[PDB]
Amino acid sequence: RILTKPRSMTVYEGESARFSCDTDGEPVPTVTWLRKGQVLSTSARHQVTTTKYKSTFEISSVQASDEGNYSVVVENSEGKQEAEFTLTIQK
């Protein structure tokens, strides 16, 4: 599980904070980005997303959320895993 975890960083605002991880599953695992930042939103405030075997979350307009420690809990159609990191922001 957790084929690869997203590193970390510190951005200012919609400057990058790009993230992308990898995870196996059967069929395909599940992912839920979140970290006391309102589940890293998904589109109204963040460009979060997930693919067949690789997910990723980007921030081109961080809002109230985004403050530092940001993680991704990815299940496995039966199991549960997680990769935590820390992306802060400077409004």
Cβ(21)–Cβ(55) below 8 Å: yes
**What does the angle CA 5 – CA 19 – CA 40 come to, to the nearest 5 degrees?**
100
Sequence-distant (≥ 6) Cβ neighbours of residue 11 within 8 angstroms: 17, 59, 62, 87, 88, 89, 90
- φ/ψ region of 41 (left if φ > 0, alpha if ψ in -120 to 50, else beta) reads left
User: What CATH code is carried by the domain that includes residue 26?
Assistant: 2.60.40.10
Q: How was this structure determined?
A: NMR
Q: What is the CA radius of gyration of the chain?
A: 12
3-state helix, strand, coil in the chain (%, to 5): 0, 35, 65
As for how many domains the chain has, the answer is 1
Q: Residue 67: give the domain boundaries.
A: 1-91
Surface-to-core class of residue 64, CB atoms within 10 Å of its CB (0-12 exposed, 13-18 middle, 19+ buried): exposed
Give whole-number Cα distances, 25 to 28, 36, 42, in Å.
4, 26, 21
